[PDB]
């Protein structure tokens, strides 16, 4: 294969800024790579989105939640394509 | 309610109807009910007249029952059996703070119980983190703030203190049960008294604070309270004490 | 008459276009720099009864607001009210004293607004050894102040200064130098940071090696540097380096690990060194003493601080130069 | 089944039932059974008081059946003359059991000192029969089963401003007694 | 750029793009707020509006939305109505603008007589409990043409929730004035209108119910 991930289309957010924060906040995990954990990721997300405003987002809190979850599966499938590679190499 | 609060005060009352005398499927046996079994009946030999205030209380019961069933259906049955303070506690666990505001207005109930409930959740806030605030917003949205309504900036427990402040500014008791219950819960959960409450409740009164220093080992702080007591005696700080006498000396 | 006998305080607007002088004459004069040049007395009026000590201005991002203090046990808050606006003709702009925080029984020793990025607060210190910290809950009333905090300093207040915050984990702080000069009190500057965990100030530090009557303290602009720098003008020239090592996650405002360093020491004024002022980056020093002399300072290739110039207020300044080595 | 949905009762899962929508009649046999039950809620000779209480604790298992039995005893609750009798009716309800307990406690606080005490010289306590013991312990088993399976009954009991079993049981445990009931 | 004393909006624009190329959101927020306040000081209301929507601060949006509301009370006219009509999904970020938009929406859809969607929007906004106390005035006032309906297609349940909310807001307005009292000067004669309007309502309620019962024929 030569698969690639689907681009994120973030509406509340600036993908450049998210990826900056991602590169800054990813950490060495016990699988041999520097990647931020999903839990840390998501509640950093909630913290930062709460850091600004809060007037009428109350109704859009769903949309915030599904978009957070969707970015979660994005990173999940990033990992999912990743792990295969090294065992491909060993094989 | 509408039909009658239309009317001039002369017709402002209605007799309570007589019990029974109902059945279904006309032309049938005289007695038919879906919710049966009984052990007594209200006095029908002596009738009663029903007035705006009575009807207001019955409506309050009804609308409380519906609000209960709305936020969670499981509640209508006990709502049919719940009394005023019973619904007050059910609201304490539910979170309809402004509804309790209305209920204390109508039934003239003890706001204190509401103070303990909200204060206990607010302490759980002051100790809690992001998730606690996340749930907190879900009911804090029902309340509105004149400084600014909502803003996810700043934690929930902040506007929780502020909401208590506002509820104080808009409901008053000539007897400060509310101060006392709040402060006792604070100290029962180990809370040093907040400065804003310090200043406001001193600027109303201070010796009451003094004997609660005594009661709950607030000894150093009492010592200061005494120091500025004497100093105001020397000068003028009774305003800060909620005292009004002009001061030059002792 | 007014401001013609002595100047008690001079204040400028943010970014610099406006000026004002208050004196012991009980009146204030407000001056405006035309962008075409020349300084014009735009208004003047009485604000208090004592020798008007200081005036500090709320941010232009928060209106043309003056805060004045004196020997009056009181502090006045004047606002600029525009007569007419919206195109044709601008009516006489007038000063409305929004409120006077009267919280004092001694000399009102300093008044200072907060940085805005956490919200704007206001701090007032009195010769009582007490500081009062108000914020405006009302984002629309200019006469509203709720007193969030007060600290009993146990030392008569003389100068206070905010801690710049430029981080998502930085919480602000207050440094206080005391005009006390008793030779039995060791350390005239105290440090109190808002311990967020308790949601209230806890004392972060107090620094020894101080015994002089404090006249001026100067924070470093926060920037990305974790470490912070302080300059002190009491009767000497002191400069200190403060590296934050690490703090307890729940007692951060109570306990602080600062690598504290007496890094620059200059006694060259030979009088009461009243004042220190820094670059907008806090990178060039101007130091003023009681002898009418000001020394200018650059830190070298090795960060070493040096008097790059001497100006006499009681004499003629040293000459300008651009040809050294 | 012994809980016909004709009985007024509703929960946040009972909207699929006909207690949020009018009318429902179970089959004749179970209607007769649970109806005869509903009348036995109101007619009782004292010799059968306890095995009927075994009815009660049996049916007290399970949350929804517990809520139904709560409703049935609420029907047995309220002012009456048929749950106040040990013959011809059931000497048991929240009202019955609670006035019994409060009178026991007031008697024992006259037989013992006031609050903030355990023991003091006072008039002798109330006499207890082994039948009183059996009834009390059994009814307590029933009450515990019900409050476990039904949070609604639990909150209703804790909220009862005219009973305050909290302070009641405070005084009761301050009392010194054969500690089975303690 | 916090040492600069900005007085030239075009220079501000150049700085704006300068920040744009590297995505400094916060500086933009600060400068937009400052220049909006300059605009409001000059009473340049639309300019302050522009700076605010740049800043994305719904707080100021609502604050000057109150300007809009009370000036509409004073003059009876839609203000920056052209700006109002075409703001997009950003309405869902400011309730006071939500109010104003739904208000113009109603004026229109009523003016072309879509009473059903009028009632839908009104029921939605009341169960949203929108607008301050001096403006739940207008929320109450809105029901009059629905009263004027001499022919209705609404359901009996519809009439239910309608009137439900009518007196619900009625009690709520009684208490918003004071938690046990009312003190607004408008209420008394307004209360009179309340009785006459609910009179007409109940008569039309008899009318609607007889029609609906005959609708089952």
Coordinates of N, CA and C in Angstrom, one line a residue, chain C residues 83-165:
Chain C
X83 N -18.2 65.5 25.9 CA -19.4 66.3 25.7 C -20.2 65.9 24.5
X84 N -19.6 66.0 23.3 CA -20.3 65.6 22.1 C -19.4 64.7 21.3
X85 N -20.0 63.8 20.5 CA -19.2 62.9 19.7 C -19.9 62.7 18.4
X86 N -19.5 61.7 17.6 CA -20.2 61.2 16.4 C -20.3 62.4 15.4
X87 N -19.1 62.7 14.8 CA -19.0 63.6 13.7 C -19.0 65.0 14.2
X88 N -20.0 65.9 13.8 CA -19.8 67.3 13.9 C -19.7 67.8 15.3
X89 N -18.6 68.5 15.6 CA -18.4 69.1 16.9 C -18.1 68.1 18.0
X90 N -17.1 68.3 18.8 CA -16.8 67.5 20.0 C -17.0 68.4 21.2
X91 N -17.9 68.1 22.1 CA -18.2 68.9 23.2 C -17.1 68.8 24.2
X92 N -17.2 69.7 25.2 CA -16.1 69.8 26.2 C -16.0 68.5 27.0
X93 N -14.8 67.9 26.9 CA -14.6 66.7 27.6 C -14.4 67.0 29.1
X94 N -15.1 66.3 30.0 CA -15.1 66.7 31.4 C -14.7 65.5 32.2
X95 N -14.2 65.8 33.4 CA -13.7 64.8 34.3 C -14.7 64.5 35.4
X96 N -15.1 63.3 35.5 CA -16.1 62.8 36.5 C -15.3 61.9 37.5
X97 N -15.2 62.3 38.7 CA -14.6 61.4 39.7 C -15.6 60.2 39.9
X98 N -15.2 59.1 39.4 CA -16.1 57.9 39.4 C -16.3 57.4 40.8
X99 N -15.3 57.2 41.6 CA -15.4 57.0 43.0 C -14.1 57.2 43.7
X100 N -14.1 57.5 45.0 CA -12.9 57.6 45.8 C -12.9 56.5 46.8
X101 N -12.0 55.6 46.6 CA -11.8 54.6 47.6 C -11.1 55.2 48.8
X102 N -11.8 55.4 49.9 CA -11.3 56.2 51.0 C -10.6 55.3 52.0
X103 N -10.2 54.1 51.6 CA -9.6 53.1 52.5 C -8.2 53.4 52.9
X104 N -8.2 54.4 53.9 CA -6.9 54.7 54.5 C -7.1 55.6 55.7
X105 N -6.2 55.5 56.7 CA -6.1 56.4 57.8 C -4.7 57.0 57.9
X106 N -3.9 56.7 56.9 CA -2.5 57.2 56.9 C -2.2 57.7 55.5
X107 N -1.0 58.0 55.2 CA -0.6 58.5 53.8 C -0.9 57.4 52.8
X108 N -1.6 57.7 51.8 CA -1.8 56.9 50.6 C -0.5 56.8 49.9
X109 N 0.1 55.6 49.8 CA 1.5 55.6 49.4 C 1.8 55.1 48.0
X110 N 0.8 54.4 47.4 CA 0.9 54.2 45.9 C -0.5 53.7 45.4
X111 N -0.7 54.0 44.2 CA -1.9 53.5 43.4 C -1.4 53.0 42.1
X112 N -1.8 51.8 41.6 CA -1.3 51.2 40.4 C -2.3 50.2 39.8
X113 N -2.6 50.4 38.5 CA -3.5 49.5 37.8 C -2.7 48.2 37.5
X114 N -3.5 47.2 37.2 CA -2.9 45.9 36.9 C -2.6 45.8 35.4
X115 N -1.9 44.7 35.0 CA -1.8 44.3 33.6 C -3.2 43.8 33.2
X116 N -3.5 44.0 31.9 CA -4.9 43.8 31.4 C -5.1 42.4 31.0
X117 N -4.1 41.6 30.6 CA -4.3 40.3 30.0 C -4.9 39.3 30.9
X118 N -4.9 39.5 32.2 CA -5.8 38.7 33.1 C -7.0 39.4 33.5
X119 N -7.3 40.5 32.9 CA -8.2 41.5 33.4 C -7.5 42.5 34.2
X120 N -8.2 43.7 34.3 CA -7.5 44.9 34.9 C -8.1 45.0 36.3
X121 N -7.1 45.0 37.3 CA -7.4 45.3 38.7 C -6.7 46.6 39.1
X122 N -6.9 46.9 40.3 CA -6.2 48.1 40.9 C -5.8 47.9 42.3
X123 N -4.5 48.3 42.6 CA -3.9 48.1 43.9 C -3.6 49.4 44.5
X124 N -4.0 49.6 45.8 CA -3.7 50.8 46.5 C -3.0 50.4 47.8
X125 N -1.8 51.0 48.1 CA -1.1 50.7 49.3 C -1.1 52.0 50.2
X126 N -1.1 51.8 51.5 CA -1.1 52.9 52.4 C 0.0 52.7 53.4
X127 N 0.4 53.9 54.0 CA 1.5 53.9 55.0 C 1.1 53.1 56.2
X128 N -0.1 52.5 56.2 CA -0.6 51.6 57.3 C 0.0 50.2 57.2
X129 N 0.9 49.9 56.2 CA 1.3 48.6 56.0 C 0.2 47.7 55.4
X130 N -0.7 48.2 54.7 CA -1.8 47.5 54.1 C -2.0 47.8 52.7
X131 N -2.3 46.8 51.9 CA -2.6 47.0 50.4 C -4.0 46.4 50.2
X132 N -4.7 47.1 49.2 CA -6.1 46.8 48.9 C -6.2 46.5 47.4
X133 N -6.9 45.5 47.0 CA -6.9 45.0 45.7 C -8.3 44.9 45.2
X134 N -8.7 45.8 44.3 CA -10.0 45.8 43.8 C -10.0 45.3 42.3
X135 N -11.2 44.8 41.9 CA -11.4 44.6 40.5 C -12.8 45.1 40.2
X136 N -13.1 45.3 38.9 CA -14.5 45.8 38.6 C -15.3 44.6 38.1
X137 N -16.2 44.0 38.9 CA -17.1 43.0 38.3 C -17.9 43.5 37.2
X138 N -18.3 44.8 37.3 CA -19.0 45.4 36.2 C -18.1 45.8 35.1
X139 N -18.3 45.3 33.9 CA -17.5 45.6 32.7 C -18.1 46.8 32.0
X140 N -19.1 47.5 32.6 CA -19.7 48.6 32.0 C -19.8 49.8 33.0
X141 N -19.7 49.7 34.3 CA -19.7 50.8 35.2 C -18.3 51.2 35.5
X142 N -18.1 52.5 35.5 CA -16.7 53.0 35.8 C -16.6 53.4 37.3
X143 N -17.6 53.3 38.0 CA -17.6 53.6 39.5 C -17.6 52.4 40.3
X144 N -17.6 51.2 39.7 CA -17.7 49.9 40.5 C -16.4 49.4 40.8
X145 N -16.1 49.1 42.1 CA -14.9 48.4 42.5 C -15.3 47.4 43.6
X146 N -15.0 46.1 43.4 CA -15.2 45.1 44.5 C -13.8 44.8 45.0
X147 N -13.6 44.8 46.3 CA -12.3 44.6 46.9 C -12.1 43.1 47.0
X148 N -11.4 42.5 46.0 CA -11.0 41.1 46.1 C -10.0 40.8 47.2
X149 N -9.1 41.7 47.5 CA -8.0 41.3 48.4 C -7.5 42.5 49.3
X150 N -7.0 42.1 50.4 CA -6.1 43.1 51.2 C -5.1 42.3 51.9
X151 N -3.9 42.8 51.9 CA -2.7 42.2 52.6 C -2.2 43.2 53.6
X152 N -2.1 42.7 54.9 CA -1.4 43.5 55.9 C 0.1 43.2 55.8
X153 N 0.8 44.2 55.4 CA 2.3 44.1 55.1 C 3.1 44.0 56.3
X154 N 2.6 44.4 57.5 CA 3.4 44.5 58.8 C 4.5 45.4 58.7
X155 N 4.7 46.1 57.5 CA 5.6 47.1 57.2 C 5.0 48.2 56.4
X156 N 5.2 49.5 56.8 CA 4.5 50.6 56.2 C 4.8 50.6 54.7
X157 N 3.8 50.6 53.9 CA 3.9 50.5 52.4 C 4.6 51.7 51.9
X158 N 5.5 51.5 50.9 CA 6.1 52.7 50.2 C 6.0 52.5 48.6
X159 N 6.3 51.3 48.2 CA 6.2 51.0 46.7 C 5.8 49.6 46.5
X160 N 4.9 49.4 45.5 CA 4.3 48.1 45.1 C 4.5 48.0 43.6
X161 N 4.5 46.7 43.1 CA 4.7 46.5 41.7 C 4.2 45.2 41.3
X162 N 3.5 45.1 40.1 CA 2.8 44.0 39.6 C 3.9 43.0 39.0
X163 N 3.5 41.7 39.0 CA 4.3 40.7 38.3 C 3.8 40.4 36.9
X164 N 4.6 40.7 35.9 CA 4.1 40.4 34.5 C 3.8 38.9 34.3
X165 N 2.7 38.6 33.7 CA 2.3 37.3 33.3 C 2.2 37.2 31.8

